[PDB]
Design a protein around this ligand. Sequence first.
Ligand SMILES: C[C@H](CC(=O)O)c1cccc(-n2c(C(N)=O)cc3ccc(OC(F)(F)F)cc32)c1
Ligand SMILES: C[C@H](CC(=O)O)c1cccc(-n2c(C(N)=O)cc3ccc(OC(F)(F)F)cc32)c1
Ligand SMILES: [Ca+2]
Length: 122
Amino acid sequence: GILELAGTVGCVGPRTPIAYMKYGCFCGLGGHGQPRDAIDWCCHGHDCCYTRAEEAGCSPKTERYSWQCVNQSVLCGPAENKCQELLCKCDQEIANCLAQTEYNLKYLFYPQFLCEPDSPKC
Ligand SMILES: C[C@H](CC(=O)O)c1cccc(-n2c(C(N)=O)cc3ccc(OC(F)(F)F)cc32)c1
Ligand SMILES: C[C@H](CC(=O)O)c1cccc(-n2c(C(N)=O)cc3ccc(OC(F)(F)F)cc32)c1
Ligand SMILES: [Ca+2]
């Protein structure tokens, strides 16, 4: 869920998870358009990951899972079911993706009216 999303992102990367609440066209609730930069691409991939988990019968926003932060790396588990492993994998993936990025301040609170109706495929 959102609790673990924040935690995992914080674990691996250098910045407050707040930084991704509203960034580019994809970091934030929903998302559509051309991803603006590497960060936005990470969020696009993560949005896609969450869609796949919803399609698998999981609740990515709320469902709790266990994980550990070791040397700024996320280790997933232990899992009780497949949804916990799927969600941890999604969040681990975005945490790793974002940690390798430079933050572009100009995409913080980027206006939604500039984001295109069409998006890249998942
Ligand atoms: C966005 C940017 C992330 C980057 O450069 O890496 C940044 C820079 C400096 C401080 C913060 N920053 C932090 C923090 N610990 O760095 C907490 C916090 C809380 C609210 C807030 O304002 C807003 F508008 F971004 F929510 C901004 C907040 C974020
Ligand atoms: C869960 C929902 C997925 C949806 O609709 O799209 C959502 C809502 C708001 C922000 C994010 N969201 C995304 C994202 N894929 O949009 C990346 C990310 C990274 C850290 C983070 O931390 C915090 F604190 F903002 F929650 C929040 C983050 C996700
Ligand atoms: Ca999103």
